[PDB]
From Swiss-Prot:
Transmembrane segments: none annotated. Ca(2+) binds at D15, D34, T35. This is Nuclease A. Residues 109-129 are annotated as: Disordered. The lineage of its organism: Bacteria, Bacillati, Bacillota, Bacilli, Bacillales. The gene is nuc. It comes from Staphylococcus aureus. The active site is at R29, E37, R75. It is found in: Secreted. Residues 109-125 have a biased composition (Basic and acidic residues).
Amino acid sequence: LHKEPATLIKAIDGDTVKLMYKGQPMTFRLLLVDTPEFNEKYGPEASAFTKKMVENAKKIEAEFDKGQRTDKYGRGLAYIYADGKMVNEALVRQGLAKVAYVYKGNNTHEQLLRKAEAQAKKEKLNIWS
Ligand SMILES: Cc1cn([C@H]2C[C@H](OP(=O)(O)O)[C@@H](COP(=O)(O)O)O2)c(=O)[nH]c1=O
Ligand SMILES: [Ca+2]
């Protein structure tokens, strides 16, 4: 997989963010995770965590997997990095997202993220509390 440039347009919630990618505004949905909706428990904390991560970053990159790059809503499907740290993995490691939506052929970082979930769960963090 390859990291590609993007710039932040706007934080949305725990697992979607609006980025400019190849010069075009797009909403990205983070691969392999599910944060609570803003209206749900930990939803505001997830939104806050992603917002802080992407807004503080000097460099945002989007990494597509091997499969579908857009979902049925037209959202980009990618792993998003902030100054080299994967947002997807960070949310899971903090107990603010569950590993989820693991579809065949867009699942390169599956085992990485499950390892993070196990550790958040061992720690009883947030969702696992
Ligand atoms: C993460 C992801 C979501 N989706 C679709 C599945 C779900 O369809 P449904 O809308 O029919 O439930 C939806 C969940 O995204 P959200 O968690 O943002 O609501 O997005 C994909 O198709 N591929 C993906 O990789
Ligand atoms: Ca969600």
